[PDB]
Amino acid sequence: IYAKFVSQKISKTRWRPLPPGSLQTAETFATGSWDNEENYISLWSIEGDHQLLCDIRHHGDVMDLQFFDQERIVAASSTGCVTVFLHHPNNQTLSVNQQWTTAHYHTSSAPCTGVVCNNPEIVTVGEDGRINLFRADHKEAVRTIDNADSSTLHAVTFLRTPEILTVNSIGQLKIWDFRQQGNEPSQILSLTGDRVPLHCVDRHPNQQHVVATGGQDGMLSIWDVRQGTMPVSLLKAHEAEMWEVHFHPSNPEHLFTCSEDGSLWHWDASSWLSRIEITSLLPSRSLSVNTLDVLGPCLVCGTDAEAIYVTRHLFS
Numbered sequence: 001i002y003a004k005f006v007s008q009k010i011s012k013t014r015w016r017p018l019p020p021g022s023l024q025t026a027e028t029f030a031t032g033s034w035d036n037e038e039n040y041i042s043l044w045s046i047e048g049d050h051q052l053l054c055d056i057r058h059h060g061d062v063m064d065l066q067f068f069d070q071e072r073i074v075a076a077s078s079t080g081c082v083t084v085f086l087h088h089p090n091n092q093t094l095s096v097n098q099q100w101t102t103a104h105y106h107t108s109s110a111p112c113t114g115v116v117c118n119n120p121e122i123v124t125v126g127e128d129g130r131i132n133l134f135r136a137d138h139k140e141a142v143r144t145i146d147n148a149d150s151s152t153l154h155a156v157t158f159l160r161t162p163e164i165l166t167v168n169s170i171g172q173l174k175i176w177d178f179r180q181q182g183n184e185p186s187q188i189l190s191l192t193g194d195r196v197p198l199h200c201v202d203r204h205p206n207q208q209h210v211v212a213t214g215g216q217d218g219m220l221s222i223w224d225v226r227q228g229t230m231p232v233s234l235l236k237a238h239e240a241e242m243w244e245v246h247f248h249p250s251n252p253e254h255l256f257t258c259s260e261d262g263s264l265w266h267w268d269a270s271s272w273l274s275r276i277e278i279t280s281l282l283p284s285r286s287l288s289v290n291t292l293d294v295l296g297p298c299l300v301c302g303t304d305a306e307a308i309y310v311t312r313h314l315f316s
Contacts, residue, residue, distance in 0.1 A: 001281060001299075001311040002048045008033035008040060010302025012065035015295040016043075019070065025312055026298040028053065030073055032062025034290075041065070041075060041085060041094065048310060056085060056094040060111075068117045068136070072097060076112035080104035082124050082134065098137065104128045114155040116164075125153040125166055133162065133178045143178040147185075157203045157211060159225065167198035167213055173223060189229050191221070200244045205252050210272060214242025218259055222272045232273050238263055243290050256294055262286035264301055266314070282309060 012032040018024065027046045033039045039062060042055040060077030068074050073085045073094075082104075086097035104110040104126030112126040121142075122134040129147040147153070152169040159165050162178040171191035180186070191198070197216040204210035213221045218238030221231040238259035248254035253270035257263075262285065268277045281299070282289060292301035297314045 001309055003307045003309050004050060005305075005307055006031075006042075007306055009035045009304045009306055010290060010308055011062045012291045013300045013302040013308060014065055014067055014073075014293045015298060015300060017067055017070055018295070026295040027312075029293065029300050029310075030065060030067070031302060031308065032058065032065045032075060034061035034063075034078075041073065043087060043092075043094065044308075046310065046312065048312065050308075050310060054087070054093050056096075058083075063111055063113055064115045066115055066117045068122065069119050072136075074115050074117055074122055076103075076115045076124060076126075078109070078111045080110045080112050080126060080128070082112055082115060082122070082132070084122075084136070100124075100132070100134055100141070103132055103134075103141075104130055113153055114166075116156055116158055118158055118161050121161065123156055123158070123164055125156045127152050129153060131156070131164070131166065131176060145176055145178070145180075146183050147174075148183060154197065154199050155201045157201050159203060159211075160208045165201065165203070165211060165225070167201045169197040170194040171196045171198050171215065173198070173201070173211070173213065173225075175225065187225065189223055189225065189231070191215070191231070191234075199241055202245050202247050204247050204272070205249050212245045212247065212255065212272070214245045214257055216241050218242050218261065220245065220257060220267075224273055235276075237265065243288070244292055246292060246294055248294055250296065254294075256292055256299070258289035258292050258301060260288045262289060262303070264289045264292055264309075281311075 011034040015026040016028040039058045043053040044050045060079035064076040083099040084097045104112045110128035114125045124132045131145040133142045173189040174185035175187045200214045220235045220237045222233040240260035255267040266279045287304040
């Protein structure tokens, strides 16, 4: 593993997906920054090293970031705007491809807090309680659900599309479907109480009913949406907020979490619904680790020390 300092607090880091049926490992990743007057979305290509491929100014903090496909990156802004940026296949520059400037708003600006992609669909959530389904090259949302909750939506994942699951500031998981009538969830699960925000969620890659969430209190919870209103497992973990949680996409016996307390943990259960081994990957006294991504043996993460950490050799 190695660090590179980049003069911006990094909110989001994501690997560019590999061409289908590629045998090479990930080598390009995107970053989004926050807490600057001038925030950026940047692309980087790879003692290891990486260099700046191109960048673009982003208005507002980068609240979330996902690749939609190899060339399109979707960003959520603190302004409420959702933007598709295009990385050109031939000239490698970034440009604004399309956007929904009123994805989230108060009727005042409402941050877009989460986005997930399943090409051609894009799903977004925000502090206005709106849940949007967008499709590439459609000017208007395909569907918007106006959630009437007094809580704040913090993150979203697909279950089986067009079914989704959201988590909120009072510790509830809510399930929705964009084909549904009305604005109510189909099911709710939650923590014991209303005092513990959930900040992140990820679905298991092969078991569409299994999700992991991370909380204000640093704990990892595992849920089975077929089973009751409560978690299956509640595991002590970090000393402060868990900001992201990811199942490894090709071997989900591995799972990764990161925290405000400066930690990034590699959990190795090699089932989550039933002795898990944990390794802490970053140095002691790191500032908040805001984000991570993993693909094959490659891990990238970004911190409030204005650092990006990379390894392309997690298992060798």
